């Protein structure tokens, strides 16, 4: 995890030290070999007259930092000048014998999902707000859920749009081999904090959705004017309580990059463990809602052992709303630095989460009977 900056600084010091050494001992010992000329790659101040002069590998280069101390036999000329290989200023190719598309594929896959999902959620929110017959606490919690999904989508797009800003642009790299860049701006750091907040606020508008569903089936109703305020505060405010401390910790003890690399896994526990807690609670709610549903289907007394079809439909239409697909790999944390497992963990989580907004939008705004009757009626009243 060597920083470019760290490497750059390291090289600069090596160069300064080399300049000092060359000024100290520029004069040749025998006056019949290569002069003490410090190249950008390495110094090679010493010269063997018509022989090979081992020049050790640089004291500062991530590439070969762990590599052994092999040198670079400079085959200099006895005439005192540098030799030439194939009309090149320098031969001695012993110079520094020293030393993924999966991520791209995942990028394309989830970028497509976030796109198709953000579009459908904007449409769904417009539909769900316009009709004014659908205003109810249920659909208000849904509207906040849709807004959280939309914020997640925009946050992701923006998040990877600035990642290359201070990396891919060769401008940055040229400006990093010298002065400062976009890596040091605070604007950049906050793009990634916004991303953490918008994701955390999405897991807590799934928790709120599940808790509201649970409290209808289990508890007596209370003031629909106060519960809604509590739910809004939980969904939008609780995430702050652990994404602001994470920002503080990153600003203090780990500020390299723009808070993109989780170098210290412990500091990343602070904005993860709460998310695992939310999805675990929502999984419990999912289990208890499904057992209530099967209880009703049994006690219907009209069951004809086809209840598995209806129960499968109910489970599949409840999975996206509570985000329960997230639990099958939630306990495989990043202490499981594997290969195939890691890829799978990422693949399933990124792919399903990206399209989760699309599935929620469809299941709860496009095939809903209530919203289908809103249209049929609006179409009949059109003349």
């Amino acid at each position: 995890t060597v920083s470019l900056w760290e490497t750059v600084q390291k090289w600069r010091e090596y160069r300064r030290q080399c300049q000092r050494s060359l000024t100290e001992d520029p004069p040749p010992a025998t006056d019949l070999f290569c002069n003490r000329t410090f190249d950008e790659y390495a110094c090679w101040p010493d010269g063997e007259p018509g022989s090979f002069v081992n020049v050790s590998c640089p004291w500062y280069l991530p590439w070969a930092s762990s590599v052994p101390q092999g040198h670079v036999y400079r085959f200099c000329t006895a005439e005192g000048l540098w030799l030439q290989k194939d009309n090149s200023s320098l031969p001695w190719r012993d110079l520094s014998e020293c030393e993924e598309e999966q991520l791209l594929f995942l990028y394309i896959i989830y970028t497509v999902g976030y796109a198709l999902s953000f579009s459908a959620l904007v449409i769904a929110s417009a539909i769900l707000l316009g009709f004014r017959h659908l205003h109810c606490t249920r659909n208000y919690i849904h509207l906040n859920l849709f807004a959280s999904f939309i914020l997640r989508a925009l946050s992701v797009f923006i998040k990877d749009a600035a990642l290359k800003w201070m990396y891919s642009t060769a401008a940055q790299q040229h400006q990093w081999d010298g002065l400062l860049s976009y890596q040091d701006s605070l604007s950049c750091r906050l793009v990634f904090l916004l991303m953490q907040y918008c994701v955390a606020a999405n897991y807590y508008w799934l928790l709120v959705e599940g808790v509201y569903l649970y409290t209808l089936l289990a508890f007596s109703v209370l003031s629909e004017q106060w519960i809604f305020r509590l739910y809004v505060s939980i969904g939008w405010g609780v995430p702050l309580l652990f994404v602001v401390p994470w920002g503080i910790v990153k600003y203090l003890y780990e500020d390299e990059g723009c808070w993109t690399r989780n170098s210290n896994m412990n500091y990343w526990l602070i904005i993860r463990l709460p998310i695992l807690f939310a999805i675990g609670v929502n999984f419990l709610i999912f289990v208890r809602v499904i057992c209530i549903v099967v209880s009703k289907l049994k006690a219907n007394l009209m069951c004809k052992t086809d209840i598995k079809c209806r129960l499968a439909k109910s489970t599949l239409t409840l999975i996206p709303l509570l985000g329960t697909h997230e639990v099958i790999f939630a306990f495989v944390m990043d202490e499981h630095a594997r290969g195939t497992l890691r890829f799978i963990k990422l693949f399933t989580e990124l792919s399903f989460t990206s399209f989760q907004g699309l599935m929620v939008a469809i299941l709860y705004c496009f095939v809903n009977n209530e919203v289908q009757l809103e249209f049929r009626k609006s179409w009949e009243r059109w003349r």
């Binding site: 790659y41 991530p62 520094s96 290359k164 953490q196 994701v199 897991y203 904005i271």
Partner: peptide, 29 residues
């Protein structure tokens, strides 16, 4: 949380590649 790790892994890849571009260009002056 997926996007958090994906990005961390992605950033490390882009960081490591940038250092390479500095070891392959310093070599070429």
């Amino acid at each position: 949380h997926s996007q958090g790790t994906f990005t961390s892994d992605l950033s490390k890849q882009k960081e490591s590649k940038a250092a390479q571009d500095f070891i392959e260009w310093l070599k070429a002056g």
